[PDB]
Amino acid sequence: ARYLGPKLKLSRREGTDLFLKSGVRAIDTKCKIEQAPGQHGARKPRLSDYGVQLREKQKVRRIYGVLERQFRNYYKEAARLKGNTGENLLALLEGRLDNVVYRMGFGATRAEARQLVSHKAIMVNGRVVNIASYQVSPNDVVSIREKAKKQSRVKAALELAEQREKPTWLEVDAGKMEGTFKRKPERSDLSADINEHLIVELYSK
Amino acid sequence: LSPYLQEVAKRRTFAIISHPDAGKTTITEKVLLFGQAIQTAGTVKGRGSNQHAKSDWMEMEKQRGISITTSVMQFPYHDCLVNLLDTPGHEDFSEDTYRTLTAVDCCLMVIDAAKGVEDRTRKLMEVTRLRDTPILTFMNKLDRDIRDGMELLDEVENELKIGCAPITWPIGCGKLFKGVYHLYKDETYLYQSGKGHTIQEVRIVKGLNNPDLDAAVGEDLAQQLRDELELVKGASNEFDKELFLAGEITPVFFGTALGNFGVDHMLDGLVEWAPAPMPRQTDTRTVEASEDGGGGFVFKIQANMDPKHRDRVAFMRVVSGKYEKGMKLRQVRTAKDVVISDALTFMAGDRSHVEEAYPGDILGLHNHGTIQIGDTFTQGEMMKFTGIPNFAPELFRRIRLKDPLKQKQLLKGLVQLSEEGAVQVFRPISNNDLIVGAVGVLQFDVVVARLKSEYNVEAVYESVNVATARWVECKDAKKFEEFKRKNEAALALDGGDNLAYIATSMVNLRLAQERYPDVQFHQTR
Amino acid sequence: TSYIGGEGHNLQEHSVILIRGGRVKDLPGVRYHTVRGALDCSGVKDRKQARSKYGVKRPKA
Amino acid sequence: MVTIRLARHGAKKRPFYQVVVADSRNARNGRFIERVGFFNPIASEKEEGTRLDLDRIAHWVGQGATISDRVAALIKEVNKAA
RNA sequence: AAAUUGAAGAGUUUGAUCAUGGCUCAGAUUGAACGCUGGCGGCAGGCCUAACACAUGCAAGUCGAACGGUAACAGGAAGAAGCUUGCUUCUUUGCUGACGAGUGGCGGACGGGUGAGUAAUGUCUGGGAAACUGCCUGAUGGAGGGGGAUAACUACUGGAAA
RNA sequence: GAGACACGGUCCAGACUCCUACGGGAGGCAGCAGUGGGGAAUAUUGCACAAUGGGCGCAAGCCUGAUGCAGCCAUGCCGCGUGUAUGAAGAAGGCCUUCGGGUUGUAAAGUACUUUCAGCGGGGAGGAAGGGAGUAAAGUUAAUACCUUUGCUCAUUGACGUUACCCGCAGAAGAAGCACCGGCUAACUCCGUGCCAGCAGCCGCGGUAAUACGGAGGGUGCAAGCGUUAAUCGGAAUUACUG
């Protein structure tokens, strides 16, 4: 239920960096980011409209590591909820436990954050929570376990987290290794390069 | 010192292999009476008593006179429990007897003295020497005319190719029969039929040379007995416990089933000589019989007992551990735990019965085909038992299948029969043909009869073909592929997805064997 | 009538096969396909792609 | 006769009983005349694991309905706590 | 306060075009089957066809607080004897704890299975009048005095058994 | 019988199966498992009345294949895992080549970290409310007896069961496959075959330079599932009431 292949391949196919690595090293120094993977990568074939919608959907799905079945459930839930479908879907995706752990900087990559959640090292409201897909709600405080609080990778990720922009919907205390999800992130806080309207019309044929 | 240890030590397993019309069933009945399970014993065909032999549960004694179905009876002796295995013996069958022989720790061969050792016994003895199993020789029907003891001993030793040692020596032949033991104690039966029905009175008199005994029996017989006895001592080696264990020498006891005399003596000797069960060897490691944890293998499976509903019973020897009712026993082959809700044991006596089965006791398990021959049930260990004979079939006949439909019915019946050891089915890779082979002609006849009886197909057969089965295994890579391409037509798949070379002629097999030496041709799978 | 897919077959008369439906556009009157790998019809030999459609076990390395 | 009993309406290993007024001949989870409450046997704290419409229950007992042993104990518990 | 938020087309007639018009596909879904592969857990589901035939086990009993009774256990009372001087072996007494069989009350019309038959004698929606209803519940009162049987059982007897 | 024209009740006739001393009897799984048979195809001859409910009983209690559970099946839905971070000598090998190189490719090897799930050992809720013995009080009566109701004390009641869950140990080990790549439709090249073998849901490829067959490399979509088939609706405004 997890993609176990090369991570940079996905980034090359999408053209941009999907943040699948820590970010300590320059992306260009590890891959040919502007070139699609494989033997016939040099050519840039003219993509169809269905193609650009599918590419955007796959781009988001690979960004957050979600699979198709889970993603379609997320879309159904978002469509069911009140308001803008795209904002609801982005909020639902952003409400995942491992995603919030990555935003708080406990894990360098989202895959590392997911392994952290799954390996019983995170506690939501003091209770141990193991499910990577756990939806967190407003005013919830999340923290590392006492046993896992001495891991080198956690601090190694916290220092790296400073290089990236700080989320305005979270409050993290790097000393005690705790954060607080006070509200669901507004679209203006999210990266504007994602055209979520493509996904919301791709899935509603 | 512990009770389980004492019980495994007391348990003994012995099987009887006999020639046609040798009185094995009658002997079995006598054994139960001596063991005290039954107060009275009845001869086959009800010649002297109303009761019938225990071994012949069915009507086989009236139909032919020999047991056609395998029977296991457990009887208790003096501070010991003995497991008795009865196997039908014929050239036509044989393979089933070999499976039973592999499972049983020790074996006894019963032959009527007049009929002799002559045929099928050498083959049985050969399988026992291959496993180095201890063998006991029992002479039968002493009430009838009996040939010279020295001559009988020499001929049986000559056919067997193993040393023959006589525990009991006959001083009488024909109408009057008496015998003498190695301890010099003389056992006599005054009443031929008077004590036959009940337990025979134990009138054994100490001292080889006794004047009253000499006067009572023939004087000439006593003198001849003394000369024959000293000559036997010099000519043939005295019984050695180690040699018997090794299988080098076989103990011989002379007894009469009809007379009911000598069977008790044989039982006493067999119980002292017989040892506690040897550790069986699994492919992973040898498993100790004493060690806890339930380990067993199914030597034989009986099917189609009831026509309307099929209730397969699997005879399994639990080599290690003690069975408990409702215990979950892991099947190694399927890698799954099966609860043994129902397990049939044979008390064979006037006892209440107990659910718990000790190690070395045969257990029948009811199933719908779930259990298969050679399956291993273990408490938790992933160990697969070894030693199943799986001999090659001969005189193969193709199944024509005149009616195009009912093939799935035929296929289900053929695979089920193939799962048991009665018949082996081979399919050539080149063409879609079904060829069925069995070790014996009457085995084919039984298979065809059973198939018609419950799987109810036309089963047209005997289409002309000539074949011999040799299983082919090659460890080397890139050589076996060449062998397959060279003789694809000859090669045929066998059950269990095993590749077997089919030889038109023995000479063809020899030529095939000389060519491609890296590839190994195995008679037994 | 049923079309026997794949390259090469061991099918002779009196063989029990399994038809599954699906016509071939370019044959008049053939409307069904026989599944490869069911009760007697062996799979297509030396097939390494689209193996599931013709019933061949995975080749062990 | 008319009885007031429990209807097992829940998932495996996590039961939840619905206190219903049913004709005693009918099945446990089957036909009932009126539903008068629930009982969650495994409920945690801060949430009501039992609520009974005592007015209707009293009305049915006045109408001749009998009461089960477990239903009697639950009414006893509710009246003792409240 | 909420209880809804909802609608994509494409290929293919022609040298090329527009329209009419059929075929096919992308989507969702199943009591599913087959082919390849296969690690764990949670919640559901599993004869759709032959309402074709069923071996074996269980699936309706209970009440001695309705009644004669003891067929077994297990205690007591009269005892009797090996008398270890206290009840070990044995005769009675249903006297008690209970109870095989029988009479009697209640339940076998509930629970559970299937959709053959039935196109309306059924089902769903909504009205009625000419009705009964053990066990549960409210009121008003009765509950007196007799009789002849019959199982169980005893004796004989038919039948291989029922 | 209150309630049946009554699955495990009665009688008769018919077909079937069984016992027989041949005179005569017994039975009806479309109850739970379970067997032949039909079919593409559908499970265990399991444990317990511990909970809910039903029958009888004043009650203790007895019966319940209803029911609660367990066994098999990826049959469906959902969650998790098969590692994570760093790592250019862009390693070797495969494939393509304009012979310059490109691609598989941070993928692997190496370095550091983690032990989820499976394995081993230890602890441990809840589904259990009741019911039975002793009291104490109240109501009834001549009665402080007997019975009923409510408090308190005492031992107790789990098939699941090695429960869920939690803690500790060793080690990246024990865990990735399926379909497709001419257009519809996201994803392209080389080699063998020459209207043959073959593909196909439609248009249509292949007749000795095939992005359409078969194999390899690469890629695309899904993922403990993936394709194909059967069946219904949609697209079909192609029965149009809306239209």
How many domains would you count in the coordinates of chain A?
2
By CATH, the architecture of the largest domain in chain A is named Orthogonal Bundle
Quaternary arrangement of the chains shown?
part of a larger assembly
β-strand amount of chain A = 5-15%
Q: Structural class, from secondary structure content of chain C?
A: little secondary structure
The 3D shape of chain A can be described as: globular
Q: List SSEs of chain A in N-to-C order.
A: HHHHHHEEEHEEH
Largest sheet of chain A: 5 strands, antiparallel
Q: In CATH, what is the class of the largest domain in chain A?
A: Mainly Alpha
| Main interface: chain pair and counts | B-C, 8 and 8 residues
- The proportion of residues in beta strands of chain C is 5-15%
Write out the CATH superfamily name of the largest domain in chain A.
Ribosomal protein S4/S9, N-terminal domain
Can you summarize the main beta sheet of chain C? 2 strands, parallel
PDB class: ribosome
Keywords: GTP, ribosome
Entry title: Cryo-EM structure of a non-rotated E.coli 70S ribosome in complex with RF3-GTP, RF1 and P-tRNA (state I)
Chain A: 30S ribosomal protein S4
